[PDB]
Amino acid sequence: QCVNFTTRTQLPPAYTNSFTRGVYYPDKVFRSSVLHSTQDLFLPFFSNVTWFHAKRFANPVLPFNDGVYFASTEKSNIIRGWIFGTTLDSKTQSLLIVNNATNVVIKVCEFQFCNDPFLGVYYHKNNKSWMESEFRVYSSANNCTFEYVSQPFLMDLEGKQGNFKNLREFVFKNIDGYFKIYSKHTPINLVRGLPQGFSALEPLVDLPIGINITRFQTLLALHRSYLTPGDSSSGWTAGAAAYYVGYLQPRTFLLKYNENGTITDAVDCALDPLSETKCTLKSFTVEKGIYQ
């Protein structure tokens, strides 16, 4: 369990670009028909986000590069877990955030995490019973010193009807002591990769933890069928999803609001000199002429 091996080749990833995604309502206040700009940890557009095939056991530990933008699209509930902390060991008391159809739990208990065990529901144990069985992510739960529960993640039931695979983006923003989560469920139809347009991610939880976090790991929860035990990593590898990860660096966006206070278009000033002119002039239309 705690020691196993992968079932893939040596990292053939992909680096598609959404060309504009990842604006998450940075401030609490409300504006309408305003073009406010703020220096905040954002995702620059036209940036290479690493691919992650769900069918190939692709879920290594990832560094916490000043907040992590995690996005996933799927017609299922494959990806459920997010484990991140200082160094991800029992002694350091890292942070655990997972997902379940019943509730969502947050814990800081001393875990070695035993090489990221999968999660999955056994198929048709009973006609009316569907519950996750191989819940082996527990790794010597002791000296918890803290425990927390929150509202159940239950909005992943509508918006994916008809194999739309409603793309969900989770920005793991941190404010050096406080932790914020943003999400947005919008039905999509593109299957090649990231869609195009914009986003309106809203805050989820402002609750703080106080634990510095440098590395991040997510629990893909791969489980095809309980018939084949495999090597605890083999066989339970296949999936029909492909998630992505993004990292935020300081940026100054030009966020445009609307009569309903809805963000429609944003401009990354550092992206291009034209965007620099748009940010400086403080508008979206730049009249012909030379500017400084």
């Binding site: 206040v29 927390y148 703080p208 106080g210 206070g261 809805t262």
Partner: protein
């Protein structure tokens, strides 16, 4: 010459209807409270603690807060409090309330440097002073050890005379590690034991999660009042408005960095902010010698 203005008429504060909870009845009214030597450091976090129902509550033997004013406790939003489940005798109030570092106050308990742990003792007359033969309450003195503040007893070895090995319940000047509290049915008046618990605040090296409710105000409109909608002070007059305010948004804004619409924490309503009575005055007059 000058400008007239109308002073604010009322004062409005708005952070109600979140429900602190942070229960304390089970902390005080316990069916079977723990022993003195089982003083687990029970943290009380993720709650809004109350003190008016306790400080102003009468029939308490010793409600003392020496290291901090009892009234100001609800204002101070410190990290959390640590509750120690220990019970003393009626006359054993000298060991508690640091300032008298007795020998008995160093074997079964240890005192903090400063009186952060407000000692609260309530008259559990029916439970503590009962006819059930309270011989179960035993306190650890003789174990040949000296523990440290804010740590539980560190020795469970059989008590030895010193420089002479012994084992079992009998030995050469070797006594039982536990010491017996009388607590006989004669412990009714004079020095009737009281159940004691402390609330030791934690400094804000990490973000806080504990505070105390103060007050709230009713709904007033079309009047010049102090505004103070959870931080946004500054007098003004409130008018019913019909802006959107998506649920995560609580404060409005204008282009010229001004707040012009808000959401009431009581119920989700759209209000307005307008200057009360500002405006200059000019004194038209002819020549003074001609007319006055």
């Amino acid at each position: 010459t000058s400008n007239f203005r109308v002073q604010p008429t009322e004062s409005i504060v708005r952070f109600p209807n979140i429900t602190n909870l942070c229960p304390f009845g089970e902390v005080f009214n316990a069916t079977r409270f723990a022993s003195v030597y089982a003083w687990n450091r029970k943290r009380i976090s993720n709650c809004v603690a109350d003190y008016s129902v306790l400080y102003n509550s009468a029939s308490f033997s010793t409600f003392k807060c020496y290291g901090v004013s009892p009234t100001k406790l609800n204002d101070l939003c410190f990290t959390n409090v640590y509750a120690d489940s220990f019970v003393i005798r009626g006359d054993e109030v000298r060991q508690i309330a640091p300032g008298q570092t007795g020998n008995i106050a160093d074997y079964n308990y240890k005192l903090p440097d400063d009186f952060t742990g407000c000692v609260i003792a309530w008259n559990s007359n029916n439970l503590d002073s009962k006819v059930g033969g309270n011989y179960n309450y035993l306190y650890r003195l003789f174990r040949k050890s000296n523990l440290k503040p804010f740590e539980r007893d560190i020795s469970t070895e059989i008590y030895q005379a010193g420089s002479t090995p012994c084992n079992g319940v009998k030995g050469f000047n070797c006594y039982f590690p536990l010491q017996s509290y009388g607590f006989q049915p004669t412990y009714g008046v004079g020095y009737q034991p009281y159940r004691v618990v402390v609330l030791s605040f934690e400094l804000l090296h990490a973000p806080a999660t504990v505070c105390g409710p103060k007050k709230s105000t009713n709904l007033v409109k079309n009047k010049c009042v102090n505004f103070n909608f959870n931080g946004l002070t500054g007098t003004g007059v409130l008018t019913e408005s019909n802006k959107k305010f998506l649920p995560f948004q609580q404060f409005g804004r204008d282009i010229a960095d001004t707040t012009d619409a808000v959401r009431d924490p009581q119920t989700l309503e759209i209000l307005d902010i307008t200057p009360c009575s500002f405006g200059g005055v000019s004194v038209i007059t002819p020549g003074t010698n001609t007319s006055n």
